[model samples]
Target: ETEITRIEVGTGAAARSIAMRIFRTGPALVWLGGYRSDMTGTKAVEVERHAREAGTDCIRFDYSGHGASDGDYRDGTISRWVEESLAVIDHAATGRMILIGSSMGAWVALRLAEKLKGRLCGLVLIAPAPDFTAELIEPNLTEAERTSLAERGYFEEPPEPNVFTRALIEDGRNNLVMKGPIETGCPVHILQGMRDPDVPYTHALKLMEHMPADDVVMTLIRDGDHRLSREEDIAKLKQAIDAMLTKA
Candidate 1:
């Protein structure tokens, strides 16, 4: 059974409440969604089901402006999203944490692990895209995109609410993890698909380089895509979580 709750984060236009669904039990697995992503993704949903069966705590929530929560979409930055993530976790979970962050969410997870060092037990990052804004995006911008970014605060991908704001890029630089060692101080597992177009496998490899001799493992699926929503991909995801819970 899932219990849903919302907590107000601030006061003013930026003020918004994040929606969280918690499966109360032992330990905790918090699912963080990627950029413009929501809690309803396959991995997110599957993890919760597995958590329910295993009698473990699972907290899944929509980042503001993404799913069920109101967010500062036009003005949302990594810091703001990270702020909400911390607020949600602090309010909903209070024990060991095994985080599963997908895509851009992997960035959020890494940021969260930094603050949650004492309580973090393990992390399973699916197609981790930390510093994507600074590392992957900024370099590939077309001339028009650059102009759009300068004139306005954001540039769209000719996509759905796929807008990237200047604040996000500048803020992302402040939170870059690839530049140095990431002191996770806990076991880490990464799952990436080689065929994924959005985030290259090399990016994942580079992320490992900064981990600095931690207990980290990366599983590269030859056929895996950016979404990794296939049946087999989901099995691998479950196994990673299975192993993480078996520890500590």
Candidate 2:
């Protein structure tokens, strides 16, 4: 995993002005982390570990505002993060690759699928949270949160609260993939936790509705949580990657 790496800070085209890090391994397995997530998390590291053991390449990196990167976290938006994700993948990865996106990282992976097109070998989205800013946030905004949105121009949920700026909503709306059919043109394996408090399992079904033309498969963990970092969950994650690699 990441037999070679390019850890750049405020230098290079991809990492210019952004503290983006990238490591290499052929037909690479690329990791895109969730909101406020680091590349060193269990799932991220496990993906790389599996790739190493499987004799495939792996690439992992943090977004501009995440992990060891330097940027304003509040300023981070879906489009912005997607841009950075694309930048890193383009800089380091070549040929076909598998994308393992966690949580909000799923959104980035989906966008990259459309951009990268034929380069994709497959996609594995854990707790796929695409259009969450629009689907989950807007629909579930309570009166108190609405007022907070109006006054502070942002709102936060009490449980592990993170800033949700107005721009995030606007950009999220623009990046909405649930509007119509999603044509990935590649196999997609989604692992969703039924008990996920952040993203309901129904959203995964809804996502499946859009992916009308691909080898799309989804597995729901009845007792799994949002993180799905349990040992068994990691086993399932590795199995899914192994299957994708076999096909790729």
Candidate 3:
């Protein structure tokens, strides 16, 4: 039977409390959400529901600085977040896993796949935002903003502008991996929305160039946005996940 449990992992400073929901099915799917997004978001909830219906083990949790996890937002770095992802993968998942990553989560997913290369069966990426923090977002920072961050250690953009901060930029740059090939050999399926303003379609193509697995495919949605939460978009996501699981 499927069950929900709360478990703590790691030690002080690097430790975290996680809510895990498990289904009694082989080959679990671990879903990672995007930046500024949480485990309760539309995508995560939808995935949990689908996994429940299909009786597939599904694990979803928040990063250390996000959701119910412990950590200060200003101290949140990609490295720490990646560590939390690995902790969950090591402690919660069972059997082979299909990693499904969305937006920034895709970056974490790629890293996780590298760590679990021989164990990961497949990967599904939705609006993956790998290396954009350094390549795109950091490059777009204004001179004044950079100067302010250097002086004040932090600065905030408009709320409508989506809360860009010095810590986000600095840490993201430190973890940038988009300049070269990803080198992950696992089978991957990338879903990108052509109309997504935040993450351009070209980044997806560039990521495809680095993947060692020649079995990668990119699906472009003409009318989709960054969220990709519409009925049709979700249908496509389900189709991709089902296809990946079936093949695995």
Candidate 4:
């Protein structure tokens, strides 16, 4: 296995760190955490741990505004987040890679995959929520919220306990990609929970339709929720990763 390295790349506005566990015998996998989440998430850590066990390169890191990185979450937008992810992939990973994107990270992953079409070999999207900014979040906004965004310049929603935000919604809208097609054509494997209230299963199907290639497949879990971080779901995710890596 290749020697692992932990290094902080860039600083201040461009500051970010990568925990890269490299392996000589397996494919590289990048784990992109969900919105408002960090690289320390259970699933992210799990993927990295499994990658170590299998002697594969697994990379996890924080965006400019999340986790140990320096920046305000309220000031972060989808564009900034995507740029951070790209910087990590360009600087840290080597050879072919399979990107594992969760929640909002799915959208960012797709955008990055499009940019790195020559380097990406495949993708594994866990509860992938592409175009969510344009479809789910924007349409669900109340008139009062819209008014607040227009007049007050923002609106807030408590997606989770104590996770209030106006910037996430407004900035998310500005970064929506649903209005057009996603041009990434690499093989994509999506894992979705049927019980997920935040991202409906149909959204996954719709995303499949927009892919530039026919190699994309969506796996549905009957009892899965938005997080899909349960043991069973996690197993399925690992299985998907294995299959993608082994694919000819």
Candidate 5:
């Protein structure tokens, strides 16, 4: 079992804390979970195991309003989550890092890489959703959902428990990485499921187009889904990490 550490971000009533689990060693790896997801996810745990076995640094954390962290869900936005990620990385990790992002976390990872600059050693994105707020969610909003957003500044869909906030959508616009070339200054490996309903493989290709051609490599899994958590998928992820670690 790993110990959880709480790191404070803000102060007073607006104060918030981020909960994280960090492991020791070199060529650190940071796991950024998906939207509405926490650090204890399958991929995060697997990465931790690999890091422990390999004796390399690895970090996983919950964004404010997620998992064990302290904050209201409605107050969460992409910008706020990004800030929290930075804070966690700054406090918990050392030296260059290999950022592994899944879905919305992929977007967070990209933004974090931008902030880290040369400190970002490499990136591994699992079904990256860079402009999902604008390209995926907003366009799919029904008339009722649009009305809900205008009336209450948020909308909730059944089966899917997370509330989508207007603020999140607006903040996502400000943090969009698909508008132009995305330069991480490090090699990037993208793993996408061809059958992913949430983030189509085409989206991965779109991201590839935006990244530097010479430094990006994409692997498309024919039978994979959005989760990409099958045993085979996990193996692929492990292989990708091993390759990246060696190169980085």
Candidate 6:
């Protein structure tokens, strides 16, 4: 059993609440979910279970406009989401923390790491899609999609209900980290799936290029997909977190 706490952030028309489940203990772990994903995801739940068994603290939350949080999905951006994440960290977590990010959350984690500075103990990124807007979405946009973006300021990606807006793309550009060196000043581990169709394994390699060489480790999973929700994958995630906790 867990309790959900809502912390209000922003103001007026932008006012919203971020819903979070924070375990009060030590050796904190913060779970950052992917784009269009909520904190109740399998990986998040698994991490919470591990935290309970290990007697450590863990924080999980829904970004504004996602899951139970109060906001419009269209209103979300990396900048705003990062702000929300910071708010959660400031209010809910204490001491050094291990950040676990999946997909787009990996980008948010990196941004948070920059703000947290020396407070971050370690980072675990699962199929990190840094600079995904410019690197992945922009180049892959079809002629029709480009036309829609110009006229409507947003376009819908098939098989997913979330709208990809010009605001998100431009905001992503402003928050882009892979353009040059990324200095987190903490041990980093990246788990990438070779079969991931959305974020290519090469993208992970590209991220490695920007990271400091000595402190970063990358693991390539031969049969893993983008989700990496299988039993074995979850086990691997726990292993990574455990190792990071020991090292940190």
Tell me the tens digit of each residue's lDDT in model 4 across 67-150. 777666666667778877776777778767788999888988887876785278778988888767677877788898788777
lDDT of 1 by residue, 121-224 (tens): 88899999999998899999999999999999789886355788889999999988787889988889999999999999999999998897858999899999
Model 3 over residues 110-138: C-alpha lDDT tens digits? 87876774288888999999877776777
Best by lDDT: 6
TM-scores of the candidates in the order shown: 0.96, 0.91, 0.89, 0.84, 0.96, 0.97
User: What is the descending lDDT order?
Assistant: 6, 5, 1, 2, 3, 4
Q: Which one is best on TM-score?
A: 6
- lDDT-wise, the better of 5 and 6 is 6
Candidate 4 whole-model C-alpha lDDT, 0 to 1? 0.75
RMSD of each: 1.5, 2.9, 2.5, 3.4, 1.4, 1.3
**Poorest 10 consecutive residues of model 4 by lDDT?**
17-26
Against the correct fold, how does model 3 do in TM-score? 0.89
lDDT of 2 by residue, 1-248 (tens): 23334444434543434443344443788998898888879998898788778876677887877876767667778888888777777777866789999989999999999887429889999999999998998998889988987888788867467888888887899998788989887799999999999999999889988898658999899999999999999999999998898897
Please give the clash total of every predicted structure, in order: 0, 1, 0, 1, 0, 0
TM-score of 1: 0.96
Residue-wise lDDT of candidate 6 within 1-248, one digit each (tens)?
A: 67899899898989898899998754788999999889889999998888887788999999988999998878889999999999999998878789999999999999998887528889999999888999999999999998988999999886556689989998999999897889998899999999999999999999988997767988889999999999999988988888888897
Q: How far is candidate 1 from the true structure (C-alpha RMSD, Å)?
A: 1.5
Winner on lDDT (4 vs 6): 6
User: 70 in model 1: Cα distance from truth in Å?
Assistant: 0.9
Question: In model 3, where is the ten-residue run with the lowest total lDDT?
Answer: 1-10
RMSD of 6: 1.3
Between candidates 3 and 5, the one scoring higher on TM-score is 5
Q: Report clash pairs, candidate 3.
A: none
